Design an enzyme around this catalytic site. Structure first.
Site, PDB file in Angstrom:
ATOM      1  N   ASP A 144      -6.196 -12.998  -1.869  1.00  0.00           N
ATOM      2  CA  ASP A 144      -7.213 -12.806  -2.598  1.00  0.00           C
ATOM      3  C   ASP A 144      -8.211 -13.918  -3.702  1.00  0.00           C
ATOM      4  O   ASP A 144      -8.396 -14.674  -3.060  1.00  0.00           O
ATOM      5  CB  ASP A 144      -6.643 -11.869  -4.279  1.00  0.00           C
ATOM      6  CG  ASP A 144      -7.097 -11.280  -5.263  1.00  0.00           C
ATOM      7  OD1 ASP A 144      -7.079  -9.705  -5.062  1.00  0.00           O
ATOM      8  OD2 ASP A 144      -6.755 -11.995  -6.198  1.00  0.00           O
ATOM      9  N   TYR A 150     -13.503 -14.012 -12.279  1.00  0.00           N
ATOM     10  CA  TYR A 150     -14.640 -13.337 -11.290  1.00  0.00           C
ATOM     11  C   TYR A 150     -16.417 -13.728 -12.541  1.00  0.00           C
ATOM     12  O   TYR A 150     -17.037 -13.199 -12.431  1.00  0.00           O
ATOM     13  CB  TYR A 150     -14.246 -11.971 -12.353  1.00  0.00           C
ATOM     14  CG  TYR A 150     -12.928 -11.762 -10.864  1.00  0.00           C
ATOM     15  CD1 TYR A 150     -13.446 -11.085 -10.330  1.00  0.00           C
ATOM     16  CD2 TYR A 150     -11.793 -11.881 -11.121  1.00  0.00           C
ATOM     17  CE1 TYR A 150     -12.575 -10.414  -9.011  1.00  0.00           C
ATOM     18  CE2 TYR A 150     -10.719 -10.856 -10.921  1.00  0.00           C
ATOM     19  CZ  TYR A 150     -10.812 -10.307  -9.725  1.00  0.00           C
ATOM     20  OH  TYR A 150      -9.830 -10.115  -9.114  1.00  0.00           O
ATOM     21  N   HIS A 200      -3.178  -4.230  -0.860  1.00  0.00           N
ATOM     22  CA  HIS A 200      -3.165  -5.494  -1.721  1.00  0.00           C
ATOM     23  C   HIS A 200      -1.670  -6.518  -2.224  1.00  0.00           C
ATOM     24  O   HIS A 200      -2.693  -7.498  -1.137  1.00  0.00           O
ATOM     25  CB  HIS A 200      -4.475  -4.794  -3.246  1.00  0.00           C
ATOM     26  CG  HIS A 200      -4.983  -6.533  -3.236  1.00  0.00           C
ATOM     27  ND1 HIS A 200      -5.650  -7.179  -3.218  1.00  0.00           N
ATOM     28  CD2 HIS A 200      -4.394  -6.507  -4.964  1.00  0.00           C
ATOM     29  CE1 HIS A 200      -6.148  -8.204  -3.485  1.00  0.00           C
ATOM     30  NE2 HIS A 200      -5.200  -8.086  -4.434  1.00  0.00           N
TER      31      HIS A 200
HETATM   32  C1  LIG Z   1      -7.837  -2.462 -14.000  1.00  0.00           C
HETATM   33  C2  LIG Z   1      -7.914  -3.342 -13.072  1.00  0.00           C
HETATM   34  C3  LIG Z   1      -8.495  -3.032 -11.397  1.00  0.00           C
HETATM   35  C4  LIG Z   1      -8.866  -3.940 -11.079  1.00  0.00           C
HETATM   36  C5  LIG Z   1      -8.078  -5.052 -11.021  1.00  0.00           C
HETATM   37  S1  LIG Z   1      -8.679  -6.711 -10.431  1.00  0.00           S
HETATM   38  C6  LIG Z   1      -6.607  -7.058  -9.035  1.00  0.00           C
HETATM   39  C7  LIG Z   1      -6.339  -5.246  -8.691  1.00  0.00           C
HETATM   40  O1  LIG Z   1      -5.154  -4.269  -9.484  1.00  0.00           O
HETATM   41  C8  LIG Z   1      -6.292  -4.754  -7.015  1.00  0.00           C
HETATM   42  C9  LIG Z   1      -7.022  -5.692  -6.465  1.00  0.00           C
HETATM   43  C10 LIG Z   1      -7.835  -4.843  -4.881  1.00  0.00           C
HETATM   44  C11 LIG Z   1      -7.486  -4.000  -4.603  1.00  0.00           C
HETATM   45  C12 LIG Z   1      -6.380  -3.173  -5.486  1.00  0.00           C
HETATM   46  C13 LIG Z   1      -5.594  -4.152  -7.106  1.00  0.00           C
HETATM   47  C14 LIG Z   1      -5.361  -2.087  -4.799  1.00  0.00           C
HETATM   48  C15 LIG Z   1      -6.030  -1.992  -3.583  1.00  0.00           C
HETATM   49  O2  LIG Z   1      -6.186  -1.238  -2.312  1.00  0.00           O
HETATM   50  N1  LIG Z   1      -6.749  -3.156  -3.596  1.00  0.00           N
HETATM   51  C16 LIG Z   1      -7.303  -4.903 -12.456  1.00  0.00           C
HETATM   52  C17 LIG Z   1      -7.090  -4.532 -12.962  1.00  0.00           C
END
Ligand SMILES: Cc1ccc(SCC(=O)c2ccc3c(c2)CC(=O)N3)cc1
Ligand SMILES: Cc1ccc(SCC(=O)c2ccc3c(c2)CC(=O)N3)cc1
Lengths: 546, 546
Positions: free
Chosen positions: A334, A465, A523
């Site tokens: 990531d 970010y 992820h």
């Molecule tokens: C509520 C929230 C949304 C996104 C993030 S970034 C890390 C993350 O939760 C995430 C990033 C990419 C990803 C997923 C989760 C699921 C997926 O398939 N890709 C953090 C909090």
């Protein structure tokens, strides 16, 4: 009822049995039957071998004593020994070929998982041979999986003497009836049976395991493929490097060999590599699992600019400078993956090899601002909600347990609506206050991340970010470069943000790029598919990172 | 007045100059004069070389561009280039043969010691060659000695462009008149002279240094042999391993390669190896300098039995177990030396090689109790005063600064009466309340030991001397063993407690033992003779520890 299991090393936890070499040697060399075993057992409990096993003498001192017993055993049976014949040569090969009995280890691990106290009890020697490391490596690996390791040469008692058995009960703080004892030598088995312990003569692993499962009442044979060894935080070596006056970097360290630096993503921890750390150390690498700036025990300054890629990479170079490392293999996931590609581009001299999980390398568009670029994809809308300082911090810090339980879930376990988070006016809108436990994680693991995020919260993590423009300008300097050092891209089939297709053009900038792909993987790659990740990483490291 | 010195890398801090290879190559290959240098400088500030030095492209991308310029330069002058000819091959050898200019480094170090801000300013490239580590190793070594390192490829500016010079003044936060600038290229020297900086054209080091000493007013040429590089505690990587519930072990870590574990004596610190840590890391070893149990940032339990040799050695094995190290070279001084011989005897599998400074290996007399043995020698009377709990603690903890200043002194600087301390009724009887500063130590170094001993005092350290009987009984188990693994004994001529003659019979128990001896060296070997210690250790490690 049974609450402790004891295993021998030779013939039980380690195969082929070193004792069997005497039999194979005489058969191969067409020597009188048992001649080698008679010389090996000369003088009985007064002879050379007993002295060695009690720790009176070392293996190197015993080698010529066994040879003297070999010339005495041959002269009686009226036979000649060859000139190419060496006892040390025979034992070196036997010790070297003796590998861990994985099904027996799995069974010992399953019993400990179910509350059993486990121990190794073996007749062993003080190994001072030039090749001693081979066995030290095997023992070091084996021992971590048991509560106790009792070695004959260290305790000065040997099997089958009754003293060692009483010493074993004393160590286990258990009645003989509470103990299962496993051994391949019936003689060494006898005194344990005599005290009332449950015994298992081990000939073939499968039958021994059948005898073990019926006696413990736990399924040990044919059970599912177990997860790789994880890390208990309190048992790790914790390292601290000050990279600048207000910035210290924390890492967990394990193994010897080339340095492999593991870089986690958002909102993660060094613990995110828990399934890779023992595996990579065992594979012959020195693992440094980082708490990245803004995370865990590492410093988390408040300023947004402290988290731009240039600053993060310079600090990672200083980390190597202060540790005295000229290079490291850099493996990232990531946000760690993005850092790792920029380490390869900006500091190729300090990067032995580069690997990324999920994160592709995409060159900056010098014509389009990153805010325009991010807007073009609806899957990246959460990143726009991350922009305003204090907003996402508030939501993510409100309930730490809910935050991690909602995030750390597999592809089919989604609870968070990742689309139109700005429109919904919240990251947690229409999501449970008390999510179910994902099959990837235990309550204890979630609570480790909860305790880690209690020190600095989400400000530093979210700041990664918040440098879209600085990162873009910095990236444009690298537009004429290519990544020509060893590189690995690992894609996760079901990551819907960092999709495999996004990595499709990487060969244009990294011509010799290597790849791995993990199907049915979300992820959180490392904990979603730990076994496959370790397989791909170890295979690539051994071929490309030396 | 001058307060900053700036040095180039190629031809100034590093020799032979890489630029000179073009000239040697054409002369060796009997090619037209300057042909290689014309191809190397093709297109000027628009060409391949300028792009590389600004960081637009990497070295591997430039290699074929230089070759294209080599075929264009040869076709004009009507000449043929051989088939065995490779640009990469030429540069690989030139980079590999380029070593640090030690007299120039010494001069740069002496100027920094005297308050100067020092910097490296060089026209360099992004090295992504398979052999890049060679240069990363050189740069990593060089850089630690300067306040700044400005690299053309990282700043995107090149010498002789005026921008880099203004960038240099900005970094130094100094007026041009406060700066000495050293370079081997007159062209690159010109813009600094133009701003009013002091310049030195560097042809031969000796003349350049003569020009530097007259311009700074500091002696830089023909000055005494400098002490090895030391450690600033705050710049080290600090490591923490929990070996048991109430015991954590602290260590300082530097370098890559085989693990070398350094064990200090009484009443010392990891800092006691300050002169060995950078030297051993530079020599290709991973150094782990311990805070031994009872010392510094390591746990100091109160109980006497926590400091018996058996417990100390088992804890050192767990330390290796938790760090994932199958072995380490063990090097010890004084009480660390005693620990290290017992590690070799009891755990030969975990000891790659063993080395002791001052401490000989003497087998326990099974007929004579250690209290009788210690009494037989009047030089060991201080150890009898150490026996009674709380007594020596009281005296040694009363004034920490007086304690260390009185102890840490050379053979001709003695202030403490080491004889009849029990009869005198004190360790500090007839000794100064304010001793002079020993020539071995600075006030700051003494104050580091003072701060370290403020946490746990002398109880844990003194307890190392309070297990004479347990250690003796434990040692008797090893009476039939021999040390057959690689071993080094280093004697100090003027140590009147741990005398060289006491090591005379060690060959009887360690037949392949190796030796070193240091003349005019007292008890505090590492800081008394740092240069010789490093010479002996590195020589022995490279031959015996791999
Ligand atoms: C509520 C929230 C949304 C996104 C993030 S970034 C890390 C993350 O939760 C995430 C990033 C990419 C990803 C997923 C989760 C699921 C997926 O398939 N890709 C953090 C909090
Ligand atoms: C007052 C006192 C006396 C002895 C010690 S033990 C460490 C020590 O100071 C020492 C040991 C051996 C030795 C010297 C000092 C000088 C020498 O030649 N041998 C500590 C405090």
């Amino acid at each position: 009822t049974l609450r402790a299991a004891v295993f021998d090393l030779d013939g039980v936890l380690a195969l082929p049995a070193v004792f069997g070499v005497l039999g194979r040697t005489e058969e191969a060399l067409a020597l009188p039957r048992g001649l080698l075993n008679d010389a090996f057992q000369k003088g009985g409990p007064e002879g050379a071998t007993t002295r060695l096993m009690k720790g009176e003498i070392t293996l190197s001192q015993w080698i010529p004593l066994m040879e003297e017993n070999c010339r005495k055993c041959s002269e009686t049976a009226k036979v000649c020994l060859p000139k190419n014949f060496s006892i040390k040569e025979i034992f070196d090969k036997a010790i070297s070929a003796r590998k861990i009995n994985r099904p027996m280890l799995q069974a010992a691990l399953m019993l400990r998982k179910k509350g059993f106290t486990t121990a190794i009890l073996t007749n062993t020697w003080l190994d001072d041979r030039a090749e001693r490391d081979g066995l030290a490596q095997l023992m070091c690996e084996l021992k971590m999986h048991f509560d106790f390791l009792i070695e004959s040469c260290q305790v000065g008692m040997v099997k089958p003497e009754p003293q060692i058995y009483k010493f074993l009960l004393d160590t286990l703080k258990a009645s003989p009836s509470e103990v299962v004892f496993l051994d391949d030598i019936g003689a060494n088995l006898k005194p344990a049976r005599d005290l009332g312990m449950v015994t298992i003569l081990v000939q073939d692993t499968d039958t021994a395991l059948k005898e073990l499962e019926k006696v413990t009442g736990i399924q040990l044979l044919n059970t599912p493929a177990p997860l790789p060894t994880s890390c208990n935080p309190s048992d790790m070596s914790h390292g601290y490097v000050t990279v600048k006056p207000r910035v210290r970097l924390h890492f967990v360290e394990l193994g010897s060999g080339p340095a492999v630096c593991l870089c986690h993503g958002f909102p993660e921890s060094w613990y995110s590599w828990r399934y890779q750390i023992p595996a990579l150390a065992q594979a012959g690498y020195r693992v440094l699992a980082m708490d990245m700036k803004g995370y865990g025990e590492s410093s988390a300054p408040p300023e947004i600019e402290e988290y731009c890629m240039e600053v993060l990479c310079k600090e990672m170079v200083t980390f190597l400078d202060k540790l005295g490392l000229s290079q490291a293999v850099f493996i990232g996931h990531d946000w760690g993956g993005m850092l790792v590609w920029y380490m390869a581009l900006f500091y190729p001299e300090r990067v032995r090899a580069v690997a990324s999980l999920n994160t592709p390398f995409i060159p900056a568009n010098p014509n389009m601002s990153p805010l325009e670029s991010i807007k073009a994809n609806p899957v990246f809308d959460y990143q726009l909600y991350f922009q305003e300082p204090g907003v996402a911090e508030a939501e993510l810090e409100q309930n730490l347990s809910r935050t991690f339980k909602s995030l750390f879930r597999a592809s089919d376990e989604s609870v968070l609506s990742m689309h139109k988070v700005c429109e919904a006016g919240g990251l947690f809108v229409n999501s449970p206050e008390e999510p179910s436990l994902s099959r990837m994680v235990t309550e204890e693991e979630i609570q480790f991340y909860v305790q880690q995020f209690k020190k600095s919260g989400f400000r530093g993590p979210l700041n990664w970010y918040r440098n879209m423009e600085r990162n873009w300008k910095w990236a444009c300097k690298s537009l004429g470069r290519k990544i020509l050092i060893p590189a690995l891209m690992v894609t996760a089939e079901k990551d819907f943000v960092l999709v495999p297709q996004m990595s499709q053009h990487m060969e244009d900038w990294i011509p010799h790029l290597k790849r791995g792909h993990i199907e049915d993987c979300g992820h959180w790659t490392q904990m979603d598919k730990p076994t496959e990740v370790n397989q791909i990483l170890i295979k690539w490291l051994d071929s490309d990172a030396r």
